[PDB]
Amino acid sequence: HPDVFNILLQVMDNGTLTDNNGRKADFRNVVLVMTTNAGVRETERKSIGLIHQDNSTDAMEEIKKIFTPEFRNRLDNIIWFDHLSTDVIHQVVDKFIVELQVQLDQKGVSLEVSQEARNWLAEKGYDRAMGARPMARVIQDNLKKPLANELLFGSLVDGGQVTVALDKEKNELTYGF
Amino acid sequence: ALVPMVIEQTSRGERSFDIYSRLLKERVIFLTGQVEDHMANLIVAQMLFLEAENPEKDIYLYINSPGGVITAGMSIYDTMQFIKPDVSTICMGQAASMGAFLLTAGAKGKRFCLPNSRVMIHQPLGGYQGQATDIEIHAREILKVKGRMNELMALHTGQSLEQIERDTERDRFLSAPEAVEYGLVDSILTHR
Amino acid sequence: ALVPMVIEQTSRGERSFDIYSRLLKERVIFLTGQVEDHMANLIVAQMLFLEAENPEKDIYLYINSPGGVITAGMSIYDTMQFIKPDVSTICMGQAASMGAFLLTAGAKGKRFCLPNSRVMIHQPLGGYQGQATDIEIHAREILKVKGRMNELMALHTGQSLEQIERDTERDRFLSAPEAVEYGLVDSILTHR
Amino acid sequence: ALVPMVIEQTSRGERSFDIYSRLLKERVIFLTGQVEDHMANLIVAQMLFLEAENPEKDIYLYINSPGGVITAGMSIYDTMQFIKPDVSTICMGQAASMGAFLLTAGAKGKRFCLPNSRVMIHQPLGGYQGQATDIEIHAREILKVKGRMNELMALHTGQSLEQIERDTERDRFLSAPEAVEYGLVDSILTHR
Amino acid sequence: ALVPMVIEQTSRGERSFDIYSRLLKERVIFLTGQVEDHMANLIVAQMLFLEAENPEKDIYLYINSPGGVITAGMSIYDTMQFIKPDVSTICMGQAASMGAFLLTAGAKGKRFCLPNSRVMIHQPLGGYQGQATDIEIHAREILKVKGRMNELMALHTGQSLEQIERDTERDRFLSAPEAVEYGLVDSILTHR
Amino acid sequence: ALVPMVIEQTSRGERSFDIYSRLLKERVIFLTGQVEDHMANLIVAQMLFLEAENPEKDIYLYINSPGGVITAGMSIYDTMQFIKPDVSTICMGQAASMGAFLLTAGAKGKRFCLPNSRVMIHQPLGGYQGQATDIEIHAREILKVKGRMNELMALHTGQSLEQIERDTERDRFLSAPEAVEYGLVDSILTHR
Amino acid sequence: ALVPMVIEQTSRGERSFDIYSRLLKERVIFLTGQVEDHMANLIVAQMLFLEAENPEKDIYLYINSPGGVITAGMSIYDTMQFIKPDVSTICMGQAASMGAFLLTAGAKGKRFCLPNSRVMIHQPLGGYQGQATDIEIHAREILKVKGRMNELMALHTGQSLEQIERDTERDRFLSAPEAVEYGLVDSILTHR
Amino acid sequence: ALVPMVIEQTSRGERSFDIYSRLLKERVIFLTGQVEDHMANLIVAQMLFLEAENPEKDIYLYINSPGGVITAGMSIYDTMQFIKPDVSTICMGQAASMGAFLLTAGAKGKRFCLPNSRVMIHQPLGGYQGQATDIEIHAREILKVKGRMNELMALHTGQSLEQIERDTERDRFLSAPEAVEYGLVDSILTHR
Secondary structure (H helix, E strand, C coil), rough: CCCCCHHHHHHHHCCEEEECCCCCCEECCCCCCCCCCCCCCCCCCCCCCCCCCCCCCCHHHHHHCCCCCHHHHCCCCCCCCCCCCCHHHHCCCCHHHHHHHHHHHHHCCEEEHHHHHHHHHHHHHHCCCCCCCHHHHHHHHHHHHHHHHHHHHHCCCCCEEECCCCCCCEECCCCCC | CCCCCCCCCCCCCEEEEEEHHHHHCCCCEEEEECCCCHHHHHHHHHHHHHHHHHHCCCCCEEEECCCCCCHHHHHHHHHHCCCCCCCEEEEEEEEEECCCHHHHHCCCCCCCEECEEEEEECCCCCCCCHHHHHHHHHHHHHHHHHHHHHHHHHHHCCHHHHHHHHHHCCEEEEEHHHHHHHHCCCCCCCCC | CCCCCCECCHHHHHHEEEHHHHHCCCCCEEECCCCCCHHHHHHHHHHHHHHHCCCCCCCCCEEEEEEHHHHHHHHHHHHHHHHCCEEHHHHEEECCHHHHHHHHCCCCCCEEEECCCCCEECCCCCCCCCCCCHHHHHHHHHHHHHHHHHHHHHHHCCCCCHHHHHCHHHHHHEEEHHHHHCCCCEEECCCC | CCEEECCCCCCCCCEEEEEEHHHCCEEEEEEEECCCHHHHHHHHHHHHHHHHHCCCCCCEEEEECCEEEEEHHHHHHHHHHHHHCCCEEEEEEECCCCCHHHHHHCCCCCEEEEECEEEEEEECCCCCCCCCHHHHHHHHHHHHHHHHHHHHHHHHHHHCCHHHHHCCCCCCCEEEHHHHHHHHCCEEECCC | CCCCCEEECCCCCEEEEHHHHEEEEEEEEEEEEEEEEEHHHHCCCCCCCHHCCCCCEEEEEEEEEEEEHHHHHHHHHHHHCCCCEEEEEEEEEECCCCHHHHHHHCCCCCCEECCCCCEEEECCCCCCCCCEEEEEHHHHHHHHHHHHHHHHHHHHEEEEEEEHHHHHHEEEEEHHHHHHHHHHHECCCCCC | CEEEEEEECCCCCCCCHHHHHHHHHEEEEEECCCEEEEHHHHHHHHHHHHHHCCCCEEEEEEEEEEEEEEHHHHHHHHHHHCCCCEEEEEEEEEEECCCCHHHHCCCCCCEEECCCCCEECCCCCCCCCCCCHHHHHHHHHHHHHHHHHHHHHHHHHHHCCCHHHHHHCEEEEEEEHHHHHCCCCEEEEECC | CCEEEEECCCCCCCCCCCEHHHHHHCCCEEEEEECHHHHHHHHHHHHHHHHHHCCCCEEEEEEECCCCCCCHHHHHHHHHHHHHCCCCEEEEEECCCCHHHHHHHCCCCCCCEECCCEECCCCCCCCCCCCCCHHHHHHHHHHHHHHHHHHHHHHCCCCCCHHHHHHCCEEEEEEEHHHHHCCHHHHHHHHC | CCCEEEEEECCCCCCEEEEEHHHHCCCCCEEECCEEEEHHHHHHHHHHHHHHHHCCCCCCEEEECCECCCHHHHHHHHHHHHHCCEEEEEEEEEEEECCCHHCCCCCCCCCECCCCCCCCCCCCCCCCCCHHHHHHHHHHHHHHHHHHHHHHHHHHCCHHHHHHHCCCCCCCCEEHHHHHCCCCCCCEEECC
């Protein structure tokens, strides 16, 4: 609600907040972070007409008129985030794969993944509208399920190693021992 | 009232548009009745909005028109040729040389006409009253307009300019198969 | 105002449409009065919306029309034949060769008419004024249109083309039982 | 504006309809003025909606009409005879052979008329201009329509067909008691 | 727009009706202008709604009318006599034999007229063109209607039938005191 | 649309009325244009609502009228004289014997007129066509109406009845100072 | 519809007015088209509302008018002179002796006109048909009105009364610089 | 209804404007049809609102007009020249000397015209009936207006005043390339 911003005013300006017992909270060693997507839809489309306008001064800059200027006046900075590039997507897929390898080594099942399999996973779950959020579901559905079958049914127990590669002929993955 | 309202659910399940706005939301534009300045301006506004909304998705223009002013039609035609997405024209009912011009002006390979539609083409009409000099001026202007229309039709249909010039001397009525063979449309919509 | 509003409850219990929109929500389309370009365009838009909403559920077209323009009627007919769901035509009141054409144009086995309805069929009307060459052109066109309409009626009713040609030379008035026996409709709605 | 708005409370206490919609919500339909295609279509839509809403509860049709087109009236009549719930017709003001036909067409035992109403019955009117053959065709059609109307009235009122034929040769004016005795209505509404 | 909106607070303090609906909420019905079918139907609907809302509280009918159709007026009169609550008629401006009939038709003891109102009474008007037999029929009907109106007025005002018959032969203009003495109204509203 | 909307804040800060309703909320009623039955009925409804809302606060009637029907004006006049709060009439623009009558009919001491307003007074107009007896009846009635209007004006302005009778024989044009001196209005509004 | 809607944010960010209401919110009033009773009444209501809203902030009256009735214009003029805040008149397009009168009637030093505006002044028009006595009365009245208008213009523009009388004998067309030099307006708006 | 509604999401995802308001929100103003006082006033209001909203962003004026009153056009022109942001005029369809004047009146370098548009320029029309002195006055005025228009066009297009004077003696029709070469527009919009 816009009225919690009124508390946030004094929280950010004086670093102190009082509860109903009169005790004051000290915010001087507390980091205040607020996440949002305010100006996203305001700039996600081009102009209507024969001549395209700039439509760039609204770069989520119009987050004003939504945040009561006495509130924006006490923010340290409004840090805009950009959409992940394809390289960033690749790096995120690698991050998820390292996380999966750690979770698998926790059970003693070392995982080996081909770079082409990594790139297929990246191009598969690549999205700019949702960023790296659908990547987790893509990687889960593509890797965790058959591995979970192997680990739970008993065919793959402590000490196994798993490889995966792209089936370029039918756009699928490889699975083995 | 005279126009119905519809209900569709995306997030809250509360969306009531007139059926024309609901179809416009699906990138379907209706060109019906006579072609004049205000109707053509509305069609141009709809096409501009649809192009700005999604420049990659096609626009479907349903044509049922007994003709109209050449000028307003040329405005719709220029807006069709200018915007990025392919505009596909479907001729239901009739198209009398201006509905017909805009029908042949659709994106190549995407100009359809229903099996019982009727298409007519003819040279433009006009006139003027006044002194001989103004008569000559307006006659030269209408001749230039006729020549430009013949050039554009010969470009869009593939027929030679002389063939179009000989065919549009009088009213030429073309059914759906004759329109397909002539080059005005690309195919006939029959069933799903 | 002149049109009533209705109330129906699905989730919140707050839905006020004009009664025509409420009936359209139940896949019921009304074709009343003269048939012209804008009315036919509205009917076509309604049928397209209903087809896109649920391609498997029938559409009910209630026909009460003294006729109208052949072109606009052919647009409605082509849209009826094109869409996927079966459109069932119910003739209440009258159907004068265009309401009648669209009535016989319904899905086979689903064309009903009320017991006191009146159906008339006749050759199309028209005319033209001008030079002899344009007169000949427009006469050939109207003859082709009459032939096409006779072919379509002989297809939809099952009667031979010569029988339709001999019957539609003048106004042929058919009551509900005579229309059922003739082949225009399939049965008569009597009671629930 | 010209039509008033009303307030009624069921759940939230916030319901504003035009008074005609409020009365329609109570299964009360008004048939006023001349009978034509669009008015009859609106009445038919209202009756269909009321029947689909609650097929067991009666529908009250308040008739004040100087007559109208026979065709549109026959549409209303067929819709009255088709639907499941009993439709009770109350004649306030007048009923001139079409309001009167629809008044006698109500559910038996539920056709009322106010004590100062006026009821008139007469043979249908019409005409045609053209060739002798078309004149003969249209005359035979109007004679068949007159015969059908006489049959339906003799059925609904209980009088013999010859009696109706002799009575409707000219305008027959019937007050409320004469209409009750004649068989058009069943009783007279006097007080609560 | 042309009609104003008002604000009244009961529970939430948010109620915006046109001033006519606000006055109808206080059981005040306006009868202004000529009396015809649709206006009388609206008045009847308002009176029915007010009676169903609270059968014990009076209804106030403000009459300012130059007359109108006898039939529509008789519909309003029958609805006034039928419903349970007493309807009190206040004549502001004028009442020309139909506004006047409905004014004298109010609940006894509750028919008021403002001090500068004007009341006129006269025999009904009419006419017909056609054959001599139809002329005779319509003349007998209009004579019966005149007799019925004279009977009803002699009943509601207390004057003898012969006195009403002699007085309404021509236009009889009555001011507020003459209308009170005559028996049309019961008293004159002067101040709060 | 053509009429503007305004915003005012009391509790929630959300109030959008047409500017006429906003001014009515401040007890300001506009009487503009010709005076007829429906306009006078609307003015009477507004005055009744304002009186019922607060019987102690004045009502301001802004008059700009070229005259109108005597009857409708007498209705407004009777409603002005009947209600409890003082109604103050301000003449802006013109007042032609009916706007002028209602202007002089305001509460004594509260009838103002702007410095450049124009006031005209004259005997009432009328007429009738028919038999000599009806001509005599209607002439006596219009003479009685003229006499009543002269009496009311001589009462409201303070002038003798003979002076009013001699002055209103023809159109008498009075500016703001002449109207003040004559007795029609009490003073002239000049500045805040 | 024909008029656009706008969006502005103060507290909730939800405010949709017609563009005319949005500009009125900024104390901008449009006087366009012919000057008659209802348009002048609307302008007067707008000016009264703006004065009551903030008596210290100016009101901007944009004038584009081919003239109109002298009476309605005098009502607007009196309301302009009466209210407290200064009203500044901007002449865009034209001002034909009534738009022109109201333009010169603005607050001194705040009467602007665009560089391509056209201003015309002339003696008032009128007429009357009837007896010689009424002709004389109406002629004296129109002469008095002309004299009053000349006096007011000579007051507002600074020119001598004889100069205005000699200039307004016929149509006097003044461009923006000639209007500034003449004294009708104070300066010309050129750029921001 | 006749105009469609659109949906766009910024914060709550609930914004329904008529398509014209949606395009106005993108700083797109449509000038279509004849140019008269009310249409020009609406265009001026739109331009003022857009300038006050963001004085740095351009305004796009889509011109499709057969001409109109010189005065109203000069109002639009003065408002275009006065405001701060650059107004870019796009000629779709036609521009007949007033659409054409306003088209050449756009910001230099930003006046575009579609490839199939038609531009016409001519001396202004007018007339007057009356005495010889008034005829002379109005003729001098229309000659001054013609001279002013020629000066403004020679300024905006770069052509010499004598060249414009010789060219606008009669109707001069210019296509898109001829208009570009002449100096009316700066370039032709072809594709995205």
